[PDB]
Amino acid sequence: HWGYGKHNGPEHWHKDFPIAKGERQSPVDIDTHTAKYDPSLKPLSVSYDQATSLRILNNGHAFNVEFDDSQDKAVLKGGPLDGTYRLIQFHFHWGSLDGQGSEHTVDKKKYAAELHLVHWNTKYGDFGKAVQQPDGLAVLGIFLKVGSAKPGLQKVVDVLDSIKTKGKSADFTNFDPRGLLPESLDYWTYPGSLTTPPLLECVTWIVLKEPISVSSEQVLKFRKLNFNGEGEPEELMVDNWRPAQPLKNRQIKASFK
Ligand SMILES: [Zn+2]
């Protein structure tokens, strides 16, 4: 099956998922000098006050913090978006070392990790319908650098012991994703894809310029997770990132000067 190893990693995915070589794949390098300020982008609206987290799952590629998306409780709107996108889950991509782990790059700089807050367009009714549409998803991408601890991440770090292996889940209620946001909502935006199979070209990417800081101890706990199932050979869950893909016929827009 697909993964991040020598025999099933990103350079192999195109054999089962030919859209891997498509016209709007993600992630990309963000060339900060070429990105155009777009004075017409509307204000970005992150409304997470009523968010309802339910569960945390190790799916064998990453961990997902899942939300109740059966009503408009946690929504992303404005910026480049038309209409209302509902938070369904967040996950991270990270490295074996602090010098790699992000999927997007900024002037070829790699961050230690990247948070993806996944939202689906309410006009398509559910996530499965939304991923079939070019405007189905909005993913808020946030870079992690290693420095000071992020207090709002520790509740996540402290549950990972309970979901070490593929297929393990744990109750994860009352987690506030506002604790993972940087001060500034200045962003870059472009049309792209899921960065994991099935690599569907359904994402409006919104990548924040300001990283968040996490501690060395916090990312070490991410690196103790396993890709494998319980009672299988231990394979550390590290380097679960796809490298930068060709930009092709796309323009990256900046919300800021
Ligand atoms: Zn992701």
Q: Nearest 5 degrees, angle CA 168-CA 125-CA 127?
A: 30
d(Cα 218, Cα 180) in Å, to the nearest integer? 13
Structure tokens at 252: 């990256």
Q: How many CA atoms lie within 13 A of 132 on its CB side?
A: 6
Q: Is the bond leading into 198 cis (omega within 30 degrees of zero)?
A: yes
Residue corresponding to tokens 């790059």:
105
CA of 121 to the centre of ligand 1 (A): 17
What determination technique applies here?
A: X-ray
Decide: helix, strand or coil at residue 15.
helix
Report d(CA 70, CA 126) in Å as an integer. 9
CB contact at 8 A, 10 and 47: no
Please state, in angstroms and as integers, the Cα–Cα distance from residue 139 to each residue in 24, 56, 190, 195, following that order. Answer: 15, 19, 11, 11
Set out the domains of the chain in order of their start, with CATH numbers: 1-257 (3.10.200.10)
Nearest-angstrom CA–CA distance, 153 and 110:
21
Binding residues for substrate: 195-196
- Rounded Cα distance between 133 and 40, Å, is 24
Nearest to 141 by CA among 110, 190, 104: 104
Could you tell me which residues are beta bridge partners of residue 204?
A: 138, 191
Residue 152 sits at φ, ψ, to 5 deg, of -70, -10
| CA of 83 relative to ligand 1 center, distance in Å | 22
91 Cα to the center of ligand 1, angstroms: 6
Active-site positions?
A: 61
Q: 3-state DSSP: the chain helix, strand, coil percent, rounded to 5?
A: 15, 30, 55
Reported as half-sphere exposure (CB side, CA atoms, 13 A), residue 115 has a value of 26
Contact of 85 with 137, CB cutoff 8 Å = yes
Provide the annotated binding site.
91, 93, 116, 195-196
- Identify any residues that bridge with 78 across adjacent strands, giving them in sequence order: 44
Tokens encoding 116: 């993806």
Measured from the Cβ of residue 37, the count of other Cβ atoms closer than 10 Å reads: 10
Q: Is 226 helix (H, G, I), strand (E, B) or coil?
A: strand
Q: Which residue's entry shows tokens 């300020």? A: 37
Burial of residue 64 (number of CB atoms within 10 Å: 0-12, 13-18, 19+): buried
Decide: helix, strand or coil at residue 217. helix
CA 167 to ligand 1 center in whole angstroms: 18
Say which residue the tokens 């506002």 belong to: 178
Annotated binding site for Zn(2+): which residue ranges? 91, 93, 116
Residue appearing with tokens 């990105």: 35
Ligand 1 center from residue 187 Cα (angstroms): 17
Could you tell me the two tokens for 114? 């990247």
